[PDB]
Design an enzyme around this catalytic site. Structure first.
Site, PDB file in Angstrom:
ATOM      1  N   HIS A  89       0.862  -1.124   0.078  1.00 60.43           N
ATOM      2  CA  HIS A  89       0.044   0.046   0.103  1.00 60.43           C
ATOM      3  C   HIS A  89       0.837   1.150   0.149  1.00 60.43           C
ATOM      4  O   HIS A  89       0.428   2.341  -0.165  1.00 60.43           O
ATOM      5  CB  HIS A  89      -1.115  -0.077   1.188  1.00 60.43           C
ATOM      6  CG  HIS A  89      -0.400   0.201   2.519  1.00 60.43           C
ATOM      7  ND1 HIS A  89       0.169  -0.473   3.463  1.00 60.43           N
ATOM      8  CD2 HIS A  89      -0.297   1.828   2.888  1.00 60.43           C
ATOM      9  CE1 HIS A  89       0.537   0.332   4.376  1.00 60.43           C
ATOM     10  NE2 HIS A  89       0.280   1.723   4.195  1.00 60.43           N
TER      11      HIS A  89
ATOM     12  N   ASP B 183       0.087  -7.721   1.685  1.00 56.27           N
ATOM     13  CA  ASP B 183       0.477  -6.202   1.554  1.00 56.27           C
ATOM     14  C   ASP B 183       2.000  -6.160   1.701  1.00 56.27           C
ATOM     15  O   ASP B 183       2.497  -5.143   2.443  1.00 56.27           O
ATOM     16  CB  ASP B 183      -0.194  -5.481   2.942  1.00 56.27           C
ATOM     17  CG  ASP B 183      -0.290  -3.959   2.646  1.00 56.27           C
ATOM     18  OD1 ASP B 183       0.029  -3.242   1.658  1.00 56.27           O
ATOM     19  OD2 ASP B 183      -0.407  -3.156   3.812  1.00 56.27           O
TER      20      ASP B 183
ATOM     21  N   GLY C 206       3.322   6.796   8.606  1.00 52.22           N
ATOM     22  CA  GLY C 206       4.513   6.816   7.825  1.00 52.22           C
ATOM     23  C   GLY C 206       5.776   5.635   8.395  1.00 52.22           C
ATOM     24  O   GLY C 206       6.617   5.961   7.868  1.00 52.22           O
TER      25      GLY C 206
ATOM     26  N   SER D   1       4.883   2.394   8.324  1.00 47.58           N
ATOM     27  CA  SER D   1       4.706   1.115   7.653  1.00 47.58           C
ATOM     28  C   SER D   1       6.141   0.501   7.000  1.00 47.58           C
ATOM     29  O   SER D   1       6.772   1.288   6.353  1.00 47.58           O
ATOM     30  CB  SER D   1       3.551   1.039   6.729  1.00 47.58           C
ATOM     31  OG  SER D   1       3.702   1.881   5.511  1.00 47.58           O
TER      32      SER D   1
HETATM   33  C1  LIG Z   1      -3.577  -1.274  -2.077  1.00 46.42           C
HETATM   34  O1  LIG Z   1      -3.322  -2.530  -2.098  1.00 46.42           O
HETATM   35  C2  LIG Z   1      -3.493  -2.817  -0.634  1.00 46.42           C
HETATM   36  C3  LIG Z   1      -3.081  -4.292  -0.334  1.00 46.42           C
HETATM   37  C4  LIG Z   1      -3.215  -4.802   1.230  1.00 46.42           C
HETATM   38  C5  LIG Z   1      -3.741  -3.866   2.579  1.00 46.42           C
HETATM   39  N1  LIG Z   1      -3.543  -4.104   3.664  1.00 46.42           N
HETATM   40  C6  LIG Z   1      -3.783  -3.148   4.630  1.00 46.42           C
HETATM   41  C7  LIG Z   1      -3.778  -3.751   6.251  1.00 46.42           C
HETATM   42  C8  LIG Z   1      -4.168  -1.885   4.601  1.00 46.42           C
HETATM   43  O2  LIG Z   1      -4.186  -1.192   5.452  1.00 46.42           O
HETATM   44  C9  LIG Z   1      -4.299   0.384   4.990  1.00 46.42           C
HETATM   45  C10 LIG Z   1      -3.139   1.071   5.009  1.00 46.42           C
HETATM   46  C11 LIG Z   1      -2.616   0.952   6.470  1.00 46.42           C
HETATM   47  C12 LIG Z   1      -1.711   2.023   7.234  1.00 46.42           C
HETATM   48  O3  LIG Z   1      -1.920   3.167   6.930  1.00 46.42           O
HETATM   49  N2  LIG Z   1      -0.582   1.375   7.630  1.00 46.42           N
HETATM   50  C13 LIG Z   1       0.640   2.285   8.493  1.00 46.42           C
HETATM   51  C14 LIG Z   1       1.157   3.322   7.830  1.00 46.42           C
HETATM   52  O4  LIG Z   1       1.942   3.992   8.419  1.00 46.42           O
HETATM   53  N3  LIG Z   1       0.791   3.408   6.423  1.00 46.42           N
HETATM   54  S1  LIG Z   1       1.939   4.869   5.967  1.00 46.42           S
HETATM   55  O5  LIG Z   1       3.392   4.678   5.889  1.00 46.42           O
HETATM   56  O6  LIG Z   1       1.678   5.925   6.521  1.00 46.42           O
HETATM   57  C15 LIG Z   1       1.283   5.129   4.118  1.00 46.42           C
HETATM   58  C16 LIG Z   1      -0.050   5.152   3.502  1.00 46.42           C
HETATM   59  C17 LIG Z   1       2.435   5.571   3.218  1.00 46.42           C
HETATM   60  C18 LIG Z   1       2.263   4.198   2.937  1.00 46.42           C
HETATM   61  C19 LIG Z   1       1.283   1.964   9.853  1.00 46.42           C
HETATM   62  C20 LIG Z   1      -0.001   2.635   9.994  1.00 46.42           C
HETATM   63  C21 LIG Z   1       0.140   3.986  10.637  1.00 46.42           C
HETATM   64  C22 LIG Z   1      -0.781   4.601  11.289  1.00 46.42           C
HETATM   65  C23 LIG Z   1      -2.422   4.281  10.913  1.00 46.42           C
HETATM   66  C24 LIG Z   1      -3.180   5.494  10.417  1.00 46.42           C
HETATM   67  C25 LIG Z   1      -4.681   5.203  10.267  1.00 46.42           C
HETATM   68  C26 LIG Z   1      -4.971   3.992   9.171  1.00 46.42           C
HETATM   69  C27 LIG Z   1      -5.301   2.753  10.229  1.00 46.42           C
HETATM   70  C28 LIG Z   1      -5.366   1.404   9.278  1.00 46.42           C
HETATM   71  N4  LIG Z   1      -5.847   0.210  10.235  1.00 46.42           N
HETATM   72  C29 LIG Z   1      -6.423  -0.889   9.445  1.00 46.42           C
HETATM   73  O7  LIG Z   1      -6.468  -1.194   8.342  1.00 46.42           O
HETATM   74  O8  LIG Z   1      -6.908  -1.755  10.495  1.00 46.42           O
HETATM   75  C30 LIG Z   1      -7.130  -2.948   9.872  1.00 46.42           C
HETATM   76  C31 LIG Z   1      -6.741  -4.114  11.247  1.00 46.42           C
HETATM   77  C32 LIG Z   1      -5.312  -4.649  11.195  1.00 46.42           C
HETATM   78  F1  LIG Z   1      -5.335  -5.840  12.116  1.00 46.42           F
HETATM   79  F2  LIG Z   1      -4.651  -3.605  11.777  1.00 46.42           F
HETATM   80  F3  LIG Z   1      -4.626  -5.045  10.051  1.00 46.42           F
HETATM   81  C33 LIG Z   1      -7.754  -5.164  11.278  1.00 46.42           C
HETATM   82  C34 LIG Z   1      -7.657  -3.974  12.449  1.00 46.42           C
HETATM   83  C35 LIG Z   1      -4.137   1.172   8.750  1.00 46.42           C
HETATM   84  O9  LIG Z   1      -3.022   0.880   9.512  1.00 46.42           O
HETATM   85  N5  LIG Z   1      -3.902   1.197   7.218  1.00 46.42           N
HETATM   86  C36 LIG Z   1      -4.720   1.458   6.280  1.00 46.42           C
HETATM   87  N6  LIG Z   1      -3.972  -1.240   3.040  1.00 46.42           N
HETATM   88  C37 LIG Z   1      -3.884  -2.517   1.968  1.00 46.42           C
HETATM   89  C38 LIG Z   1      -3.771  -1.941   0.595  1.00 46.42           C
END
Ligand SMILES: COc1ccc2nc(C)c(O[C@@H]3C[C@H]4C(=O)N[C@]5(C(=O)NS(=O)(=O)C6(C)CC6)C[C@H]5/C=C\CCCCC[C@H](NC(=O)OCC5(C(F)(F)F)CC5)C(=O)N4C3)nc2c1
Ligand SMILES: [Zn+2]
Length: 197
Positions: free
Chosen positions: A75, A99, A155, A157
């Protein structure tokens, strides 16, 4: 058809220094150079360390080297190439169901060792060089010992969860939040990485 654009490469813009007794983020490339590098895919900067800070034109996140593979989240990176000294490098691993994506580890990077300790006392490394204690709660879940707003995890992940001995236990994937407070994290276990390899 002739006007169709091509997405840029992921670009390393910094790293999390875990070398000494203090963890701290270092930036190795600014905004302008990042944009330039994403379009050409040519990155001549020296790479060091285990945890890289990476960026696209629209997103910034982390990437972690484990067993000679630079891992990050789909993602963030999608199917993008990564910039390298000789041009864009195609992903050698892509799993949207996890992911997860991966490239060959850059020349000069150091790889973390997969953990075989079986310990549940973990540590999450964020893009701001915070080392957050996390208790493992499942195959892919861990709870923050000190909850905090999700803003502090955004930011990060692609960053590592480490065991007490500094082995890679997983790759940070998603945050579990309630009222904006991150109480738990979801991560890709290192074993899932090892089976993909
Ligand atoms: C498109 O093709 C695909 C394929 C598979 C896939 N699989 C995923 C699980 C996924 O999730 C989305 C991205 C991730 C995230 O933002 N991840 C970080 C992160 O930092 N990103 S990032 O670096 O800022 C960025 C966007 C630049 C890259 C670490 C988070 C940090 C803060 C959270 C912010 C609010 C968001 C809270 C949210 N929570 C949650 O979805 O809960 C679910 C659940 C769990 F168990 F957690 F999985 C059942 C409860 C969350 O974390 N999301 C949303 N997208 C995809 C997409
Ligand atoms: Zn270990």
């Amino acid at each position: 058809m002739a006007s169709m654009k091509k997405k840029g490469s992921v670009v390393i813009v910094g790293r999390i220094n875990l070398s000494g007794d203090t963890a701290y983020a270092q930036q190795t490339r600014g905004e302008e150079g990042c944009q330039e590098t994403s379009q050409t895919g040519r990155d001549k900067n020296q790479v060091e360390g285990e945890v890289q800070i990476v960026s696209t034109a629209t997103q910034t996140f982390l990437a972690t080297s484990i067993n000679g593979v630079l891992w990050t989240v789909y993602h963030g990176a999608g199917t993008r190439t990564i910039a390298s000294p000789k041009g864009p490098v195609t992903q050698m691993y892509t799993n949207v169901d996890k992911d997860l994506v991966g490239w060959q580890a850059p020349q000069g990077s150091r790889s973390l060792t997969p953990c075989t300790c079986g310990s549940s006392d973990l540590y999450l490394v964020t893009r701001h060089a915070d080392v957050i204690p996390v208790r493992r709660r499942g195959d892919s879940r861990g709870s923050l010992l000190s909850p905090r707003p999700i803003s502090y995890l955004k930011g990060s992940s692609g960053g590592p969860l480490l065991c007490p001995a500094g082995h890679a236990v997983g790759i940070f994937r998603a945050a579990v939040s309630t009222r904006g407070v991150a109480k738990a994290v979801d991560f890709i276990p290192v074993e899932s990485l090892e089976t993909t390899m």
